[PDB]
Amino acid sequence: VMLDLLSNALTAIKNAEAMGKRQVVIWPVNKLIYYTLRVLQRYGYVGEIEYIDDGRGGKYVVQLLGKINDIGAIRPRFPVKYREIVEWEQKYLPARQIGILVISTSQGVMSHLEAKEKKIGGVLLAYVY
């Protein structure tokens, strides 16, 4: 039974990227998938995110750029405080300069860098590098 769409979508990108594919279709989808992919596209890990309209919720077709070394959703969605994000930073990322985390804060979904500048924490979503 399908339970979490974000982990399903993020693993599809990992599978399709490892085969050197140009694009990947994603279905089903929610707003959390879209707002995460916007953060990914903002950091150059993902090309254009086209949207398709079916009766069954909708789809996204994402152009991959070979910019992903690894990707995945952090489970469970752990609460994190602002002073703690450094600790979670070194858990999922290589090097202090490389890679980002996707956090779902009360101001919206942002990268962990944009959360550190705003001085807020939230619920962890994913990691990319």
Binding site: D54, G55, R56
Partner: protein, 149 residues
Amino acid sequence: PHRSRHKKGRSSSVRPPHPTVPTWIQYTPEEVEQLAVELARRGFPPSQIGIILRDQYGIPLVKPITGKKLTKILEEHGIKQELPEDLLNLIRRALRIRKHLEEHPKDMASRRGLQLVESKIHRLIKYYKRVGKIPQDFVYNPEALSHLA
């Protein structure tokens, strides 16, 4: 069975993504509703009513044409079901098996089929009590429901 099936099929109807009224349709929304009531008074169930509308009268989907659903349409014109149609179907399936099991007490294959059906009944009673479509005191007594056969 419900679990550990050998085959997991995909058979279903692929409806249009955003169904709208067919241009060929010769039926107003009032004609479409009245057709369903005649079938309902004739005795067809809501699943079979829709098949007769599409196959005989060429009505693709009553929802886009009328803006309502078949049970909601039948509900408004005094057609009220004793239980929801899915639940009544499972109860009738159990009585026809429990009648079979009387003269064939050693039909072990039929007993497991009864246990699957009688568990599908219990899941739907749990759901329907929560949404309130059936009374909260409802109990599946096979002897107390013999009239539903």
